[PDB]
Amino acid sequence: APQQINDIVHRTITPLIEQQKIPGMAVAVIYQGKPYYFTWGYADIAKKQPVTQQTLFELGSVSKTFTGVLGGDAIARGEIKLSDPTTKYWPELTAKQWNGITLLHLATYTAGGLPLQVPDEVKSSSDLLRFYQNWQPAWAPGTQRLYANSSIGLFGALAVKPSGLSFEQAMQTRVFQPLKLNHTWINVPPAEEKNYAWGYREGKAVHVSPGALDAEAYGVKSTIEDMARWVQSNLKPLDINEKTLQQGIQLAQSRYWQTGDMYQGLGWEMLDWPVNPDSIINGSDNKIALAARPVKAITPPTPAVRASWVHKTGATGGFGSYVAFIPEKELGIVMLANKNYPNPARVDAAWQILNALQ
Amino acid sequence: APQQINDIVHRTITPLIEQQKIPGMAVAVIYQGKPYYFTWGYADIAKKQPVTQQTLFELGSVSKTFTGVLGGDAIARGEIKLSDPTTKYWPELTAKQWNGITLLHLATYTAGGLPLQVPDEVKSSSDLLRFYQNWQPAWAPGTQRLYANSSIGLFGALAVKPSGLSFEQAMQTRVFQPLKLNHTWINVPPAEEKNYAWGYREGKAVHVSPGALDAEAYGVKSTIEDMARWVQSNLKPLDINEKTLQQGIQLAQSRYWQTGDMYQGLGWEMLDWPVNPDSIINGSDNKIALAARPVKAITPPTPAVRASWVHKTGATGGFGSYVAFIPEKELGIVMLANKNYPNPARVDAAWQILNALQ
Ligand SMILES: *[B]([O])([O])C1=[C]C([N]S(=O)(=O)C2=[C]C(S(=O)(=O)C3=[C][C]=[C][C]=[C]3)=[C]S2)=C(C([O])=O)[C]=[C]1
Numbered sequence A, B: 001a002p003q004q005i006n007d008i009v010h011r012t013i014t015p016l017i018e019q020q021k022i023p024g025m026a027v028a029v030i031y032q033g034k035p036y037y038f039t040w041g042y043a044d045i046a047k048k049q050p051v052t053q054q055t056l057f058e059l060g061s062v063s064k065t066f067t068g069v070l071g072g073d074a075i076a077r078g079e080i081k082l083s084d085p086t087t088k089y090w091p092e093l094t095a096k097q098w099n100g101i102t103l104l105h106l107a108t109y110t111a112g113g114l115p116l117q118v119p120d121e122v123k124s125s126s127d128l129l130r131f132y133q134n135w136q137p138a139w140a141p142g143t144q145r146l147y148a149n150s151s152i153g154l155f156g157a158l159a160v161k162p163s164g165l166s167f168e169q170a171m172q173t174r175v176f177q178p179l180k181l182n183h184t185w186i187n188v189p190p191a192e193e194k195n196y197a198w199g200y201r202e203g204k205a206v207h208v209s210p211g212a213l214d215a216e217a218y219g220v221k222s223t224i225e226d227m228a229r230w231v232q233s234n235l236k237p238l239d240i241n242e243k244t245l246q247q248g249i250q251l252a253q254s255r256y257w258q259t260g261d262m263y264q265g266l267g268w269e270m271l272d273w274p275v276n277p278d279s280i281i282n283g284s285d286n287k288i289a290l291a292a293r294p295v296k297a298i299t300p301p302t303p304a305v306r307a308s309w310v311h312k313t314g315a316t317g318g319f320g321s322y323v324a325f326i327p328e329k330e331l332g333i334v335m336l337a338n339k340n341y342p343n344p345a346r347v348d349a350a351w352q353i354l355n356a357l358q
């Protein structure tokens, strides 16, 4: 634990925790490829359980990065193609608005306005079918980006159909296990409930509620150690043995669309490095990250760029997460909290830390 | 070499040499990853110099597969992007018709009708510039594929621009050398002239003549063992130590475009395996291969497919070549002759051999 890293992390995080009134937090800095952990506060306030390197946190939409890589792995396996029509994998989706909507569009939120949330009324496979059949796009495919669980969520469910495996079974078998993420779950096992931190919203202990496509859009829970390992994997996919998984990670970091100084990947979002702090800090604010924005197509997509600031924010009703890394510097960071707080604060703290380490 | 291979090669190639009256020939069959060589006739009729594993043949447009991989390597290095306008690498190309024409278009013959040949009168950099500034499109970019030295030739020249290296130096240091192709040259040095075979056209001995963008479009000369090595590298790039070259080879085999049952890559052309022999055999006829055909964009490109028949025909006034391989079966073949005989005959022979072997 070099003092250099120790000081910047504590000087940055300590004030953050107090200002935002965060109950518990865990941080990992990947420096020169090695991980360094830090923890604060409580996982369970009621029974004074502290946050440890084994505490499980709800990742919220950071889960989308796993979904993007799983999809990319299915592509490398030749099971699917981003160029394939959404109907090729779900024939019963006969409504005319689907005609030219591809898996690429679903994966990158550019299908034409799929909604941020899948209605709570949707549950059955049938209910899900009606939802997408009755949906009316606002724009043509590939013209505008609208962040949505309905898009990437569907991408995830369809990308695994050729496998014959459940989305969960495919994730654990093709991503979790190969990478040694032995404490990363879509469904928390009874044996791990003791490590499952509680989330806090308005002082109440809460856990994410079940919902259609939850696993594919915001259902993963992990530890700071597994997330650090997840970061190292995305930092240097070349060190991964499973050929298709190595390839899947590279595809998830490719640049498919551009809006402003931001590039959309599969789950991951990227910006050229050196990046402008204000661009990423102010860009993370929901009011901006959730808005409808026209996109320019990158034809063909740009293969993962080493000199990039790769990241993803994530939240549930009671948790707030953030992951960011720079492949070219072999530097990265993970911040997990059992309190949902402003994205700008997360990104500012991460920037302050990584910029200080180079 | 196993009698299975010796048997099918001897019964297929020897009759071919007799029928086409080929002076000299070299064939290499890659079986289960290992190469086996066969040679016939003379490299130099007068002086009766035999064809050996050290004989250099002019590859013709098979050179385009090298240009494609060098281009792919430059992409992997982050020096260029296929999405970028052609004018970004050639600020001098200001004519309005070039707006919208990207490196991708140049590399895949989809620019809009760039001519098959660069006029013989065009020599200087000055001649080249006004030639391109004066070119007028037959179609809009990205709509029709017209095989041409003018397109891929310019792609090659611009692709190495960022490196500051010459095309020959870039190719030598980034492709030939890392793959141990120690007897492959763009410009044959004095010490290798005794191994440089003569081509034959109407009985007269001939060598390819100099021309604008020749190096980038049809200027490579190689031996049968170097080419077998080239096939092995393209068969399984995961065995290549140089990261960017490994990726560059995989990029050259990606499917950017589709016309009929064939897909256009960077230099390489591919078809799904199993393939209809009649398709590739008749499709090889220049009456077809040199004709414009509408293309369907593959958005985004499909990463190199293992179950593919990958190939490329090549010829000069005195030479005829052919290379083809099937990644999924670690099977491939190289055919070099110092006589330019019909493409369909080359492809039929090659299909007879590989189909008998797998
Ligand atoms: B992702 O973290 O960007 C994300 C995830 C979800 N699904 S969820 O069930 O995890 C919930 C998140 C919230 S929230 O208040 O953090 C939020 C964040 C952004 C936009 C709206 C609400 C409450 S439940 C959603 C979702 O369900 O809308 C959105 C984004």
Ligand SMILES: *[B]([O])([O])C1=[C]C([N]S(=O)(=O)C2=[C]C(S(=O)(=O)C3=[C][C]=[C][C]=[C]3)=[C]S2)=C(C([O])=O)[C]=[C]1
Pocket: B059, B060, B061, B062, B116, B117, B149, B208, B209, B211, B217, B218, B286, B290, B313, B314, B315, B316, B317, B340
């Ligand atoms: B490529 O082999 O498909 C190719 C190469 C060239 N350049 S070249 O200077 O090597 C010449 C080739 C010929 S040719 O008669 O073998 C031929 C082959 C295929 C199509 C047309 C002509 C004569 S010079 C060219 C070119 O036009 O210079 C075309 C294709």
